[PDB]
Amino acid sequence: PRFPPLPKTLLIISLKMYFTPSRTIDYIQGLLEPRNDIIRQENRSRLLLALIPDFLTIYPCSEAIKEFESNLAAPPPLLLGAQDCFWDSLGPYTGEISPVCLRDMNVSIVELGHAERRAIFGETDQQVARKAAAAADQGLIPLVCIGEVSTLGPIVSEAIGRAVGECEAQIRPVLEALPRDAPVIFAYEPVWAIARVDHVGAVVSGIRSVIERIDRHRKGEVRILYGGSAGPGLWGPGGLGKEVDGMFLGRFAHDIEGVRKVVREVEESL
């Protein structure tokens, strides 16, 4: 085990660039708070939460998790992610974050190729792949965001064919760059939508098929999440959970009670 094993269900909270430091510290302390009933021992092996703060609060986030773990004797209660990293270990790359340093701060997962980075900064498939490779070199699980870049046509087979093939071009360089035994998580979100479960189910089913065709027998496990902004009710009553191994929570999740509500939803669906 070079890598943490992946539970069947993954819930991800990415704070993007929305939170101030004090709000991030209060927030992660709310997640861990036992009276908040978000993190249950009985969920440990089936359901996992990741918090993905901005780079500045990874340190005190990591410190908060540790302090909470020291309350018990020796799955972590909560995974800590970063929202990006560089494609090299250490070096002369001003403004860039090292996966070496991330691992030293007990980050377990790195979000890569977000739609926002692809649109604003022109981040490419090759770059996301090299980034995944460097994250994996440090024992970090790549979490690669994928999705169709085009507005799709009105013929469904054409539309599903395009979307899946556009995801294929994003998946292939990542799997080529990664060791076959390193785990990877792909988060799907159709970039032109800014949640149709029929559409998600169909493209995700085409994604899993794509992966099986490239490397059916790789030892590293694979998970496909919904990367879109998911609201209360979508997972269970909306059927989203029948299609994917997890999801990103939308901005309702900025309130701890919202997160509590969605964990309950997820428990009920299992």
The residue among 137 and 215 lying less far from its own copies, judged by its C-beta, is: 137
- List the structure tokens of 264: 């309950």
Closest CB to its own copies among residues 125, 221: 125
Site for its own copies contains 19 (CB under 8 A): yes
Tokens 């909270």 belong to residue? 13
Decide: is 245 part of the binding site for its own copies (CB under 8 A): no
Confirm or deny that 66 is annotated as ligand binding. no
Identify the DSSP state of 217.
T
Catalytic member of 123, 148, 166, 189: 189
Handedness of CA 93, 187, 11, 175 (dihedral sign): negative
Give residue for tokens 């509500």: 261
216 alpha carbon, distance to own chain's centre = 22
Hey, which residues between 74 and 103 contact its own copies (CB under 8 A)?
Answer: 83-84, 86, 88, 90-98, 100-102
Q: At its nearest, how many Å lie between its own copies and the CB of residue 17?
A: 4
HEC letters along 141-201: EEEEEECCCCCCCCCHHHHHHHHHHHHHHHHHHHHHHCCCCCCEEEEECCHHHCCCHHHHH
Of 12 and 174, which CB lies nearer to its own copies in the complex structure?
12
Q: How far is the CB of 189 from its own copies (least distance, A)?
A: 12
189 is catalytic: yes
DSSP helix/strand/coil, 13: strand
x/- map, 51-70, its own copies, by CB under 8 A: ---xxxxxxx----------
- Asked whether position 121 contacts its own copies by CB under 8 A, the answer is yes
21 counts as binding its own copies under rule CB under 8 A: yes
Interatomic CA distance for residues 11 and 13, integer angstroms: 7
- If one asks whether residue 194 binds its own copies (CB under 8 A), the answer comes out as no
* Residue 170 found at the interface with its own copies (CB under 8 A): no
Q: Report the C-alpha gap between 1 and 136 in whole angstroms.
A: 13
Query: What are residue 50's phi and psi, to 5 degrees?
Result: -115, 135
Catalytic residues: 114, 189
Q: Which residues bind to its own copies, rule: CB under 8 A?
A: 14, 16-22, 54-60, 83-84, 86, 88, 90-98, 100-102, 104-105, 111, 114, 116-117, 120-122
Give the residue numbers of the binding site: 16
